[PDB]
Design an enzyme around this catalytic site. Structure first.
Site, PDB file in Angstrom:
ATOM      1  N   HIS A   1      -0.917   4.839  -0.538  1.00  0.00           N
ATOM      2  CA  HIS A   1      -1.762   5.939   0.009  1.00  0.00           C
ATOM      3  C   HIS A   1      -1.129   7.297  -0.304  1.00  0.00           C
ATOM      4  O   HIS A   1      -1.187   8.189   0.565  1.00  0.00           O
ATOM      5  CB  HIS A   1      -2.111   5.692   1.488  1.00  0.00           C
ATOM      6  CG  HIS A   1      -3.380   4.927   1.650  1.00  0.00           C
ATOM      7  ND1 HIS A   1      -4.574   5.360   1.108  1.00  0.00           N
ATOM      8  CD2 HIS A   1      -3.653   3.761   2.275  1.00  0.00           C
ATOM      9  CE1 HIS A   1      -5.526   4.497   1.395  1.00  0.00           C
ATOM     10  NE2 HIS A   1      -4.986   3.506   2.110  1.00  0.00           N
TER      11      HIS A   1
ATOM     12  N   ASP B   1      -4.357   1.481  -3.705  1.00  0.00           N
ATOM     13  CA  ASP B   1      -4.504   2.419  -2.593  1.00  0.00           C
ATOM     14  C   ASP B   1      -3.327   3.396  -2.533  1.00  0.00           C
ATOM     15  O   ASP B   1      -2.562   3.443  -1.575  1.00  0.00           O
ATOM     16  CB  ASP B   1      -4.658   1.667  -1.269  1.00  0.00           C
ATOM     17  CG  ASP B   1      -5.972   0.925  -1.174  1.00  0.00           C
ATOM     18  OD1 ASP B   1      -6.681   0.841  -2.200  1.00  0.00           O
ATOM     19  OD2 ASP B   1      -6.300   0.425  -0.076  1.00  0.00           O
TER      20      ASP B   1
ATOM     21  N   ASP C   1      -5.075   8.208  -1.633  1.00  0.00           N
ATOM     22  CA  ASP C   1      -5.832   8.728  -0.503  1.00  0.00           C
ATOM     23  C   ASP C   1      -4.951   8.885   0.727  1.00  0.00           C
ATOM     24  O   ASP C   1      -3.856   8.327   0.817  1.00  0.00           O
ATOM     25  CB  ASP C   1      -7.020   7.822  -0.164  1.00  0.00           C
ATOM     26  CG  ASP C   1      -8.093   7.851  -1.230  1.00  0.00           C
ATOM     27  OD1 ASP C   1      -8.230   8.889  -1.909  1.00  0.00           O
ATOM     28  OD2 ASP C   1      -8.815   6.845  -1.379  1.00  0.00           O
ATOM     29  N   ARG C   2      -5.460   9.669   1.676  1.00  0.00           N
ATOM     30  CA  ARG C   2      -4.842   9.866   2.984  1.00  0.00           C
ATOM     31  C   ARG C   2      -3.380  10.286   2.835  1.00  0.00           C
ATOM     32  O   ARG C   2      -2.482   9.792   3.519  1.00  0.00           O
ATOM     33  CB  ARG C   2      -4.974   8.601   3.836  1.00  0.00           C
ATOM     34  CG  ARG C   2      -4.499   8.758   5.274  1.00  0.00           C
ATOM     35  CD  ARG C   2      -5.670   8.851   6.239  1.00  0.00           C
ATOM     36  NE  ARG C   2      -6.345   7.570   6.411  1.00  0.00           N
ATOM     37  CZ  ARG C   2      -7.345   7.355   7.256  1.00  0.00           C
ATOM     38  NH1 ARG C   2      -7.819   8.321   8.026  1.00  0.00           N
ATOM     39  NH2 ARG C   2      -7.882   6.141   7.330  1.00  0.00           N
TER      40      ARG C   2
ATOM     41  N   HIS D   1      -3.689  -4.639   2.131  1.00  0.00           N
ATOM     42  CA  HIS D   1      -4.721  -3.703   2.558  1.00  0.00           C
ATOM     43  C   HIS D   1      -4.717  -3.408   4.050  1.00  0.00           C
ATOM     44  O   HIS D   1      -5.292  -2.392   4.451  1.00  0.00           O
ATOM     45  CB  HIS D   1      -6.111  -4.208   2.163  1.00  0.00           C
ATOM     46  CG  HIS D   1      -7.133  -3.121   2.078  1.00  0.00           C
ATOM     47  ND1 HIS D   1      -8.488  -3.366   2.097  1.00  0.00           N
ATOM     48  CD2 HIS D   1      -6.995  -1.777   1.983  1.00  0.00           C
ATOM     49  CE1 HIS D   1      -9.140  -2.220   2.010  1.00  0.00           C
ATOM     50  NE2 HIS D   1      -8.257  -1.242   1.940  1.00  0.00           N
TER      51      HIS D   1
ATOM     52  N   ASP E   1       0.836  -1.225   0.000  1.00  0.00           N
ATOM     53  CA  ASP E   1       0.000   0.000   0.000  1.00  0.00           C
ATOM     54  C   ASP E   1       0.862   1.263   0.000  1.00  0.00           C
ATOM     55  O   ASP E   1       1.872   1.272   0.712  1.00  0.00           O
ATOM     56  CB  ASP E   1      -0.936  -0.083   1.206  1.00  0.00           C
ATOM     57  CG  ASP E   1      -2.152   0.810   1.120  1.00  0.00           C
ATOM     58  OD1 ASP E   1      -2.032   1.877   0.514  1.00  0.00           O
ATOM     59  OD2 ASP E   1      -3.206   0.420   1.659  1.00  0.00           O
TER      60      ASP E   1
ATOM     61  N   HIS F   1      -5.080  -6.945  -4.455  1.00  0.00           N
ATOM     62  CA  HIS F   1      -5.120  -6.025  -3.325  1.00  0.00           C
ATOM     63  C   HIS F   1      -5.838  -6.636  -2.131  1.00  0.00           C
ATOM     64  O   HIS F   1      -5.234  -6.858  -1.078  1.00  0.00           O
ATOM     65  CB  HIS F   1      -5.791  -4.716  -3.730  1.00  0.00           C
ATOM     66  CG  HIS F   1      -5.984  -3.773  -2.586  1.00  0.00           C
ATOM     67  ND1 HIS F   1      -5.043  -2.832  -2.229  1.00  0.00           N
ATOM     68  CD2 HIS F   1      -7.009  -3.629  -1.713  1.00  0.00           C
ATOM     69  CE1 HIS F   1      -5.480  -2.150  -1.187  1.00  0.00           C
ATOM     70  NE2 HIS F   1      -6.673  -2.611  -0.857  1.00  0.00           N
TER      71      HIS F   1
ATOM     72  N   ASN G   1      -9.065  -0.599  -3.545  1.00  0.00           N
ATOM     73  CA  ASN G   1     -10.431  -0.230  -3.200  1.00  0.00           C
ATOM     74  C   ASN G   1     -10.640   1.271  -3.311  1.00  0.00           C
ATOM     75  O   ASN G   1     -11.750   1.732  -3.591  1.00  0.00           O
ATOM     76  CB  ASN G   1     -10.767  -0.684  -1.784  1.00  0.00           C
ATOM     77  CG  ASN G   1      -9.700  -0.305  -0.787  1.00  0.00           C
ATOM     78  OD1 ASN G   1      -8.512  -0.533  -1.015  1.00  0.00           O
ATOM     79  ND2 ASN G   1     -10.113   0.306   0.313  1.00  0.00           N
ATOM     80  N   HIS G   2      -9.581   2.043  -3.100  1.00  0.00           N
ATOM     81  CA  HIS G   2      -9.691   3.485  -2.968  1.00  0.00           C
ATOM     82  C   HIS G   2      -9.710   4.215  -4.300  1.00  0.00           C
ATOM     83  O   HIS G   2      -9.884   5.437  -4.315  1.00  0.00           O
ATOM     84  CB  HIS G   2      -8.540   4.014  -2.117  1.00  0.00           C
ATOM     85  CG  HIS G   2      -8.822   3.993  -0.649  1.00  0.00           C
ATOM     86  ND1 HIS G   2      -9.386   5.059   0.016  1.00  0.00           N
ATOM     87  CD2 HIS G   2      -8.617   3.034   0.284  1.00  0.00           C
ATOM     88  CE1 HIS G   2      -9.518   4.757   1.296  1.00  0.00           C
ATOM     89  NE2 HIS G   2      -9.058   3.534   1.485  1.00  0.00           N
TER      90      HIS G   2
ATOM     91  N   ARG H   1     -15.293  -3.702   7.780  1.00  0.00           N
ATOM     92  CA  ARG H   1     -15.213  -2.560   6.882  1.00  0.00           C
ATOM     93  C   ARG H   1     -16.558  -2.199   6.273  1.00  0.00           C
ATOM     94  O   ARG H   1     -16.704  -1.090   5.749  1.00  0.00           O
ATOM     95  CB  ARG H   1     -14.222  -2.843   5.749  1.00  0.00           C
ATOM     96  CG  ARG H   1     -12.835  -3.279   6.196  1.00  0.00           C
ATOM     97  CD  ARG H   1     -11.835  -2.142   6.100  1.00  0.00           C
ATOM     98  NE  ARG H   1     -10.490  -2.573   6.460  1.00  0.00           N
ATOM     99  CZ  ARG H   1      -9.732  -3.362   5.712  1.00  0.00           C
ATOM    100  NH1 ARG H   1     -10.154  -3.829   4.548  1.00  0.00           N
ATOM    101  NH2 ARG H   1      -8.516  -3.688   6.139  1.00  0.00           N
TER     102      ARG H   1
HETATM  103 MN   LIG Z   1      -5.257   1.381   1.736  1.00  0.00          MN
HETATM  104 MN   LIG Z   2      -7.348  -1.244   0.037  1.00  0.00          MN
END
Ligand SMILES: [Mn+2]
Ligand SMILES: [Mn+2]
Lengths: 225, 59, 293, 274, 82, 59
Positions: free
Chosen positions: C58, C84, C87-88, C240, C56, C166, C116-117, C213
């Site tokens: 991010h 992923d 994000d963040r 993940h 990951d 993922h 997923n993101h 989740r």
């Molecule tokens: Mn992630």
């Molecule tokens: Mn993910």
């Protein structure tokens, strides 16, 4: 040789070929079904609606893989198509193949259809075999000629229309009227109420009329059903 | 997949050797056939969670 | 034509190496080109070893730069980042731009999976949309990158043994043929086989179970073992769940959880790991902690 | 630079400047979309009661600005249809007919085209051609884009506009024949376009009945003759020759006009006839 | 009483495909787990898990499945002898 | 109040529904949903939850 009853009547002068045994075709169909997919969850010869394929995708995919691996099954299918009624028993294989082809055609980003070679041939063979098996009017039997010159979604919607028509006209041992003149059982179209494609032939006509760019020569086939 | 569309508005009683015992001890045994009506049964249990005394009434 | 475009892309690569995002028109031209370069890869985009799997990200650009420092420069060491990476993070736009730029420059020296993101819904409410609006003002680049995110493959297969994806497995899916038949040109639906693939995870349970989740499921030791037997796979690699060692084995050496975004959210302080398989499929591991800023 | 409809609402020559810009941002079709959306926005009373938008001075200005943009575009049915939705086309054409001083509600076939002023005549002709083309495109099978996960907000508008489009389509179907009658009289470049539209409509209709195919064949032959007469100077007529060639082949499959050499000698059509 | 004894001579594993009653398979799984034979416990679990049979179908499919498995078993059994 | 959950553990549940999941896992998920729903009740704090399996004691 094994399936064809000798008969001994010498049909015609020397041209009339002996008719094949519906019982032999039945045996071949049943054993082929058990060989390929021993599953019987969708054994209801009436074709369920399209959404039902979503749960049955996995079995459909294994059937498709088995076919791609073993081309001989197509020739056996043609042999079974020779006899009229055996297809009604060989219904689950066709349902699986159709589900596989429908699923595959959706995930086709290519503007052209010929990019996926084997699937195109499989679809053409399926449609032609159904036509010869007489579960389709000759109008829909002509269907397989145009698959080459079509966008993927076109063929997908077309086969969806085929699914709808066959759903209306469920293949059953009945409606295969025996003829004393010739042992070959006959399914008389236009006596089922729906008769011709009607709404589905309208979709077919709309497709070919939208794609007159390269289908004008072929359009002369369907004429007026 | 159950092609049948479940329009039932209640939880039909089940037929099992436990069912007589469920009735005897004061409970409604549930048979389930889809997640939605399973959730209906679940909320039924949550509501049924209470405090009381089971008594046999007789005329 | 192609030659001059290649040299032009080189300038974009070196500039992105300097944290300087491209122009909106350049982003448009990049996404347009990337559509045609990703359309040709099926769901299980097979990749030949050697390889360097990365977990990951991010969108933490300093971390990604240190990861390049560790593993090697992209043209040299082939990479398989797993999702992923948008994000963040306070540099998510730069990170994603760099990744897609590398992918377009080199078709086969890198390959990026879909996490997923990377969808329309999640990015809107998890920063990336806000980052794009703040930086480029408008949302044209946002509607370009969100459009691109659908064309990504879903899983990768390394020399017919390693299976990199993922999230994890799913009760609906059972075989690689099913994955191949799945259609990806669709924003990740909230429920379905495609949905779960991006929200699955391991657990010491067994059987199955609803994931906390809210999406996907949670598989058990026996599920992974059965799936591996079903298809001859010998090890599945997912990224993940945040970790500490960076790489953690689970299900008795069946699923490896990788995570290559050290100090998640700048506060977790977790180390990060990267796996690398040589030509003879001789796995190793490297670890790191974010570069000084 | 971005300029929304408010600038043109306040000032008129801003529209002229924008259309003079070699790269009008937004594009003129987008300007039409925005203007007509503003015009069609429903009116919410203080009691939260929805009503049709009152036709105020601002609404009329929006409508006439959109019509001016369309006139500048020269009423290219191809561009309008491709870049604009069916309800948008319907309302724009209705507004154009109204500003042409045509009494609303009066059936088009009832008026003599020659008597009307040339502008009103071309307006009615364009309306009929658009109706025919809309019917044909509705009959065309259109690929469906991949549905995303449900989005309750946008699907409301999508379903609403789809229902309005269906209603407009059925309304047009109810009067399709009348449009054919109007176009037949109007036929006496624009002639070539009308003839091609009539031929396509005849082909679609004769999909059921083979008799209409003869009329379609005559129309297509006259269309090719018009193409030959006009030559490359077609500044408003834009028709592909390949599709009409296919139409002619399909119709010749029906009508044998002797002259085997001129007609197809292919083994394919020969086997058809055999 | 027959499955209990350990002296089987009939390819005890391969035949689990043909058996189509859930209860006997439950017995088989219990027996295998108790006697500590996981390589066959897993086969029994898979056979149970197969979707064809669930003891809750509308029985149209259950009767067909039982008929098909009977045919297969008797065919193999006839092949074995003579 | 006291909440007890007697979960069948025989092999029979290993069957799978059209969801592709075992009856046992569906039961576990249903129990989790039940506890989630019960948590909405303020009296939840007074609840003690129990599990029992069909296996012979002491297990
Ligand atoms: Mn992630
Ligand atoms: Mn993910």
């Amino acid at each position: 040789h094994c399936c064809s009853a000798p008969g001994g009547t010498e049909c015609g002068e020397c041209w009339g070929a002996p008719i094949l045994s519906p019982e032999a075709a039945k045996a071949v169909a049943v054993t082929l079904v058990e060989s390929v997919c021993p599953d019987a969850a969708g054994a209801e010869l009436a074709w369920p609606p399209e959404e039902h394929a979503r749960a049955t995708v996995e079995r459909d995919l294994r059937i498709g893989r088995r076919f791609r691996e073993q081309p001989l099954l197509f020739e056996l299918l043609k042999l079974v198509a020779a006899a009229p009624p055996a297809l009604c028993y060989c219904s689950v294989l066709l349902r699986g193949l159709l589900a596989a082809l429908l699923g595959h055609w959706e995930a086709s980003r290519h503007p052209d259809t010929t990019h996926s070679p084997w699937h195109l041939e499989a679809s053409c063979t399926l449609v032609a075999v159904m036509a010869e098996g007489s579960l389709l009017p000759p109008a829909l039997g002509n269907m397989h000629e145009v698959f080459s010159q079509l966008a993927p979604f076109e063929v997908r919607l077309l086969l969806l229309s085929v699914w709808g028509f066959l759903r209306e006209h469920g293949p059953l041992p009945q409606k295969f009227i025996f003829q004393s003149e010739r042992g070959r059982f006959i399914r008389d179209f236009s006596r089922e109420g729906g008769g011709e494609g009607g709404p589905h032939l309208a979709v077919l006509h709309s497709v070919l009329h939208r794609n007159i760019d390269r289908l004008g020569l072929f359009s002369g086939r369907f004429q007026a059903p | 997949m159950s092609v049948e569309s479940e329009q039932l508005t209640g939880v039909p009683l089940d037929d099992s050797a436990i069912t007589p015992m469920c009735e005897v001890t004061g409970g409604r045994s549930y048979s389930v056939c889809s997640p939605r009506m399973l959730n209906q049964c679940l909320e039924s249990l949550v509501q049924k969670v209470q405090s009381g005394v089971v008594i046999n009434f007789e005329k | 034509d192609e030659k001059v475009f290649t040299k032009e892309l080189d300038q974009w690569i070196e500039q992105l190496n300097e944290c300087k995002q491209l122009s909106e028109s350049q982003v448009k031209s990049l996404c347009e080109k990337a559509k045609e370069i990703l359309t040709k890869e099926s769901n299980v985009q097979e990749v030949r070893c050697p390889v360097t799997v990365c977990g990951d990200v991010h969108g933490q650009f300093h971390d990604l730069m240190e990861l390049f420092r560790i593993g090697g420069k992209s043209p040299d060491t082939n990479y398989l980042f797993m999702g992923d990476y948008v994000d963040r993070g306070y540099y998510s736009v730069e990170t994603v731009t760099l990744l897609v730029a590398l992918k377009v420059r080199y078709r086969e020296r890198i390959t990026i999976l879909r996490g997923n993101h990377e969808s329309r819904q999640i990015t809107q409410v998890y920063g990336f949309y806000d980052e794009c609006l703040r930086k480029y003002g408008n949302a044209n680049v946002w509607k370009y990158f969100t459009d691109l995110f659908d064309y990504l493959p879903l899983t990768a297969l390394v020399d017919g043994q390693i299976f990199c994806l993922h999230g994890g497995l799913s009760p609906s899916i059972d075989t690689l043929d099913h994955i191949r038949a799945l259609d990806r040109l669709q924003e990740v639906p909230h429920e379905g086989p495609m949905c779960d693939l991006l929200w699955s995870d391991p657990d010491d349970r067994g059987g199955w179970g609803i994931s906390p989740r809210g999406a996907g499921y949670t598989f058990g030791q026996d599920i992974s073992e059965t799936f591996n037997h079903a298809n001859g796979l010998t090890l599945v690699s997912r990224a993940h769940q945040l970790v500490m060692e960076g790489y953690n084995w689970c299900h008795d050496r069946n699923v490896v959880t990788i995570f290559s975004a050290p100090n998640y959210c700048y506060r977790c302080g977790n180390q990060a790991a990267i796996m690398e398989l040589d030509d003879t499929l001789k796995y190793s591991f490297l670890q790191f902690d974010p570069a000084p800023r | 630079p971005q300029t929304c409809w408010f600038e043109f609402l306040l000032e008129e020559s801003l529209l002229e400047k924008h259309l003079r810009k070699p790269c009008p941002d937004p594009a003129p079709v987008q300007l039409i979309v925005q203007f007509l959306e503003q015009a069609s926005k429903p009116s919410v009373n203080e009691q939260n009661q929805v009503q049709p938008p009152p036709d105020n001075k601002r609404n009329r200005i929006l409508k006439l600005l959109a019509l001016k943009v369309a006139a500048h575009l020269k009423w290219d049915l191809d561009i309008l249809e491709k870049s604009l939705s069916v309800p948008v086309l319907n309302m724009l054409l209705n507004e154009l007919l109204c500003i042409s001083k045509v009494p609303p509600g009066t059936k088009h076939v009832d008026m003599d085209l020659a008597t009307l002023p040339p502008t009103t005549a071309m307006a009615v002709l364009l309306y009929n051609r658009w109706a025919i083309r809309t019917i044909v495109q509705s009959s065309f099978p259109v690929k469906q884009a991949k549905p995303g996960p449900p989005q309750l907000s946008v699907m409301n508008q999508m379903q609403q506009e789809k229902e309005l489009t269906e209603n407009i389509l059925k309304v047009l179907k109810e009067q399709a024949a009348d449009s054919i009658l109007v176009l037949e009289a109007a036929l006496k470049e624009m002639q070539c376009q009308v003839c091609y539209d009539l031929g396509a409509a005849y082909f679609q209709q004769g999909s059921t009945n083979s008799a209409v195919y003869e009329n379609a064949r005559e129309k297509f032959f006259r269309t090719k003759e018009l193409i030959a007469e006009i030559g490359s100077l077609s500044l408003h007529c834009t028709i592909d020759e390949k599709r009409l060639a296919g139409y002619c082949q399909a119709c010749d499959v029906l009508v044998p006009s002797s002259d085997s050499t001129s007609q197809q000698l292919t083994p394919y059509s020969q086997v058809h006839i055999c | 009483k027959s499955l209990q004894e350990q002296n089987s001579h009939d390819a005890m594993d391969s035949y689990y495909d043909y058996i189509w009653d859930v209860t006997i398979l439950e017995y088989l799984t219990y027996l295998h787990h108790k006697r500590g034979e996981t390589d066959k416990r897993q086969i029994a679990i898979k056979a149970i898990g197969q979707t064809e049979l669930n003891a809750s179908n509308p029985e149209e499919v259950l009767q067909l499945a039982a008929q098909r498995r009977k045919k297969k078993f008797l065919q193999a059994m006839a092949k074995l002898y003579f | 109040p006291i909440l007890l959950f007697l979960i069948d553990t025989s092999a029979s549940m290993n069957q799978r529904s059209h969801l592709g999941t075992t009856y046992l896992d569906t039961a576990k998920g249903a129990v989790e949903t039940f506890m989630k729903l019960r948590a909405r009740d303020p009296a939840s704090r007074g609840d003690r939850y129990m599990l029992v399996t069909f296996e012979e004691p002491p297990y």
